[PDB]
Design an enzyme around this catalytic site. Structure first.
Site, PDB file in Angstrom:
ATOM      1  N   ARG A 115       5.012  24.170 -21.874  1.00  0.00           N
ATOM      2  CA  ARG A 115       6.116  23.429 -22.670  1.00  0.00           C
ATOM      3  C   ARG A 115       7.100  24.409 -23.228  1.00  0.00           C
ATOM      4  O   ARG A 115       8.211  24.446 -22.847  1.00  0.00           O
ATOM      5  CB  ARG A 115       5.715  22.231 -23.521  1.00  0.00           C
ATOM      6  CG  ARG A 115       5.148  20.863 -22.854  1.00  0.00           C
ATOM      7  CD  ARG A 115       4.058  20.390 -23.506  1.00  0.00           C
ATOM      8  NE  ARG A 115       4.401  18.944 -23.963  1.00  0.00           N
ATOM      9  CZ  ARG A 115       3.458  17.844 -23.662  1.00  0.00           C
ATOM     10  NH1 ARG A 115       2.463  18.061 -23.581  1.00  0.00           N
ATOM     11  NH2 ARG A 115       4.026  16.681 -24.152  1.00  0.00           N
ATOM     12  N   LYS A 161      -0.080  -0.123  -4.974  1.00  0.00           N
ATOM     13  CA  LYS A 161      -0.035  -0.588  -6.105  1.00  0.00           C
ATOM     14  C   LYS A 161       1.479  -0.065  -6.716  1.00  0.00           C
ATOM     15  O   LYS A 161       1.744   1.035  -6.600  1.00  0.00           O
ATOM     16  CB  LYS A 161      -0.946   0.090  -7.306  1.00  0.00           C
ATOM     17  CG  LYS A 161      -0.663   0.294  -8.784  1.00  0.00           C
ATOM     18  CD  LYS A 161      -1.438   1.314  -9.567  1.00  0.00           C
ATOM     19  CE  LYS A 161      -0.690   1.910 -10.610  1.00  0.00           C
ATOM     20  NZ  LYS A 161      -0.599   3.457 -10.129  1.00  0.00           N
ATOM     21  N   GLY A 180       2.721  12.464 -13.192  1.00  0.00           N
ATOM     22  CA  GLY A 180       1.583  12.078 -13.974  1.00  0.00           C
ATOM     23  C   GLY A 180       0.381  12.245 -12.935  1.00  0.00           C
ATOM     24  O   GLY A 180      -0.342  13.184 -13.017  1.00  0.00           O
ATOM     25  N   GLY A 205       7.025   9.573 -15.316  1.00  0.00           N
ATOM     26  CA  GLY A 205       7.912   8.240 -15.263  1.00  0.00           C
ATOM     27  C   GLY A 205       9.146   8.449 -15.350  1.00  0.00           C
ATOM     28  O   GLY A 205      10.111   8.045 -14.630  1.00  0.00           O
TER      29      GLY A 205
HETATM   30  N1  LIG Z   1      -4.829   3.569  -1.276  1.00  0.00           N
HETATM   31  C1  LIG Z   1      -5.510   3.622  -2.451  1.00  0.00           C
HETATM   32  N2  LIG Z   1      -6.608   3.296  -2.606  1.00  0.00           N
HETATM   33  C2  LIG Z   1      -7.264   3.496  -4.129  1.00  0.00           C
HETATM   34  N3  LIG Z   1      -6.449   3.708  -4.917  1.00  0.00           N
HETATM   35  C3  LIG Z   1      -5.207   3.758  -4.755  1.00  0.00           C
HETATM   36  C4  LIG Z   1      -4.585   3.887  -3.618  1.00  0.00           C
HETATM   37  N4  LIG Z   1      -3.272   3.889  -3.352  1.00  0.00           N
HETATM   38  C5  LIG Z   1      -2.870   4.053  -4.625  1.00  0.00           C
HETATM   39  N5  LIG Z   1      -4.197   3.916  -5.743  1.00  0.00           N
HETATM   40  C6  LIG Z   1      -3.864   4.017  -7.003  1.00  0.00           C
HETATM   41  O1  LIG Z   1      -2.791   4.393  -7.129  1.00  0.00           O
HETATM   42  C7  LIG Z   1      -2.546   5.524  -7.925  1.00  0.00           C
HETATM   43  C8  LIG Z   1      -1.229   6.393  -7.034  1.00  0.00           C
HETATM   44  O2  LIG Z   1      -0.580   6.752  -8.125  1.00  0.00           O
HETATM   45  P1  LIG Z   1       0.753   5.726  -8.311  1.00  0.00           P
HETATM   46  O3  LIG Z   1       1.044   5.071  -7.568  1.00  0.00           O
HETATM   47  O4  LIG Z   1       0.139   5.083  -9.829  1.00  0.00           O
HETATM   48  O5  LIG Z   1       1.599   6.557  -8.744  1.00  0.00           O
HETATM   49  P2  LIG Z   1       3.067   6.677  -9.707  1.00  0.00           P
HETATM   50  O6  LIG Z   1       3.274   5.015  -9.883  1.00  0.00           O
HETATM   51  O7  LIG Z   1       4.276   7.192  -8.981  1.00  0.00           O
HETATM   52  O8  LIG Z   1       2.939   7.449 -10.905  1.00  0.00           O
HETATM   53  P3  LIG Z   1       1.547   6.911 -12.301  1.00  0.00           P
HETATM   54  O9  LIG Z   1       0.231   7.326 -11.550  1.00  0.00           O
HETATM   55  O10 LIG Z   1       1.744   7.999 -13.288  1.00  0.00           O
HETATM   56  O11 LIG Z   1       2.611   6.687 -13.312  1.00  0.00           O
HETATM   57  C9  LIG Z   1      -3.885   6.080  -7.908  1.00  0.00           C
HETATM   58  O12 LIG Z   1      -3.940   7.194  -8.906  1.00  0.00           O
HETATM   59  C10 LIG Z   1      -4.642   4.858  -7.560  1.00  0.00           C
HETATM   60  O13 LIG Z   1      -5.156   4.496  -9.147  1.00  0.00           O
END
Ligand SMILES: Nc1ncnc2c1ncn2[C@@H]1O[C@H](COP(=O)(O)OP(=O)(O)OP(=O)(O)O)[C@@H](O)[C@H]1O
Ligand SMILES: [Mg+2]
Length: 415
Positions: free
Chosen positions: A38, A213, A371, A394
């Site tokens: 940092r 997700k 992250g 974020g």
């Molecule tokens: N196909 C998958 N199988 C299993 N887990 C998954 C899958 N796709 C996504 N995940 C979950 O989604 C997360 C992917 O990162 P995420 O989508 O949360 O990124 P983001 O929303 O851009 O950032 P974040 O994790 O900080 O704040 C994984 O760490 C896991 O917990």
């Protein structure tokens, strides 16, 4: 969201007064500051300015959550040490605001670098509302008004060089009345790298987003959703659903219930706006969600062991990812391809990660930061990173997203 050409390496300084809202957050052992990552950035602006010969040089803090007790010490004495060591010119840490002593100090000792504040003076926030649990209360107007007045109190030109005042407000990004808005190279880099894909970059805008997700998950989707080059690599179960049908039907039934309409919908717009979103077809799935007892096949077959689908990006997924990956467009990566942290269900993923960075040069510049990915980046090893690690995993994204960005707005272009 904007951030055309604010200003950088534009401020001429010269016996001027400079206050810098940097990236001063670190671990909390004795003093032994675990991580100088940092701090290092601060150096380009910090050093340039530090010596240019202004007379000032007040570099603000920001690291901790002085929760229950008050302004509690656990200040930044050690950091000064870090600063002193690097600079070897002498760094003085006083008050984040005033102190009769405060106005006095800055003025006293000619050119210097003073690091003070953070969010000690519950004034850089907006108190922890919701009655019950933890004391005190949010709200607050003018009292803050004084603090702001007090803060600027000894400055000329204010330079933001952290991804803070681009979502919220908080101290070091507001009050600092008096013109002169100068943004460290770091801010500059983002906007520029970040900023254009946004503009009219020919090199396509080739978009890589892993795992399902949502959350603003959903939030993420709409903004990333509009752009230039119609190439987005997003892996979702329903989409799969949406795309065809059977995969979902035996697979199971539901993804993100809201996400279902929105996703099909946003997805549609996406086709219209640009063209192509690249999903799996080949996936690997294992008994539980964890990492053990696993099966990899392409497409059709799910149910019991699931109710959403498989998990990590597998062989098929890897190739396509890689596949689009090889193909100009700029590459922006948010979250993990999936569950990148549960080895077995985190292999192909590295695979994707490699080309993008590697390509940066070849292929095209790569801007991925957050992250989850950050972990991905560190674990795999950024090694050349070649683009952007957009910290504010974020903040940047929403930012990335196109919103107005609060701190950013304050910036104009020096003036
Ligand atoms: N196909 C998958 N199988 C299993 N887990 C998954 C899958 N796709 C996504 N995940 C979950 O989604 C997360 C992917 O990162 P995420 O989508 O949360 O990124 P983001 O929303 O851009 O950032 P974040 O994790 O900080 O704040 C994984 O760490 C896991 O917990
Ligand atoms: Mg996360």
């Amino acid at each position: 969201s904007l951030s055309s050409k604010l200003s950088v390496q534009d401020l001429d300084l010269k016996d001027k007064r400079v206050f810098i809202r940097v990236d001063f957050n670190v671990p909390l052992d004795g003093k032994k500051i675990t991580s100088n990552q940092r701090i290092v950035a601060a150096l380009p602006t910090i050093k340039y300015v530090l010596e240019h010969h202004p007379r000032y040089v007040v570099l603000a803090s920001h690291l901790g959550r002085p929760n229950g007790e008050r302004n509690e010490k656990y200040s930044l004495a050690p950091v000064a040490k870090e600063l002193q060591s690097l600079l070897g010119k002498d760094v003085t840490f006083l008050n984040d605001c005033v102190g009769p002593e405060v106005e006095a100090a800055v003025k006293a000792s000619a050119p210097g670098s003073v690091i003070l504040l953070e969010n000690l003076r519950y004034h850089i926030e907006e108190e922890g509302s919701r009655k019950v649990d933890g004391q005190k209360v949010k709200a607050s107007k003018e009292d803050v008004q004084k603090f702001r007045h007090e803060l600027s109190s000894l400055a000329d030109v204010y330079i933001n060089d952290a991804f803070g005042t681009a979502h919220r407000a908080h101290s070091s990004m507001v009050g600092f009345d008096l013109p002169q808005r100068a943004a460290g190279f770091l801010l500059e880099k983002e906007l520029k790298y970040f900023g254009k894909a946004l503009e009219n970059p020919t090199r396509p805008f080739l978009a890589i987003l892993g795992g399902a997700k949502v959350a603003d998950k959903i939030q993420l989707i709409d903004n990333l959703l509009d752009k230039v080059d119609s190439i987005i690599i997003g892996g979702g179960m329903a989409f799969t659903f949406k795309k065809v049908l059977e995969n979902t039907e035996i697979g199971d039934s539901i993804f993100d219930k809201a996400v279902g309409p929105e996703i099909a919908k946003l997805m549609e717009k996406a086709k219209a706006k640009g063209v192509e979103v690249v999903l799996p077809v080949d996936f690997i799935i294992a008994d539980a969600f964890s990492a053990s007892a696993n099966t990899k096949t392409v497409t059709d077959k799910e149910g019991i062991p699931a109710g959403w689908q498989g998990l990590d990006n597998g062989p098929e997924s890897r190739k396509l990812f890689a596949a689009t990956v090889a193909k100009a467009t700029v590459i922006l990566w948010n979250g993990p391809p999936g569950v990148f942290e549960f080895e077995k269900f985190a292999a192909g993923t590295k695979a994707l990660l490699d080309e993008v960075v590697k390509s940066s040069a070849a292929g095209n510049t790569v801007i991925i930061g957050g992250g989850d990915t950050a972990t991905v980046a560190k674990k795999y090893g950024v090694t050349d990173k070649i683009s952007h690690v957009s910290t504010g995993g974020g903040a940047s994204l929403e930012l990335l997203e196109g919103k107005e960005l609060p701190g950013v707005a304050f910036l104009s272009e020096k003036k």
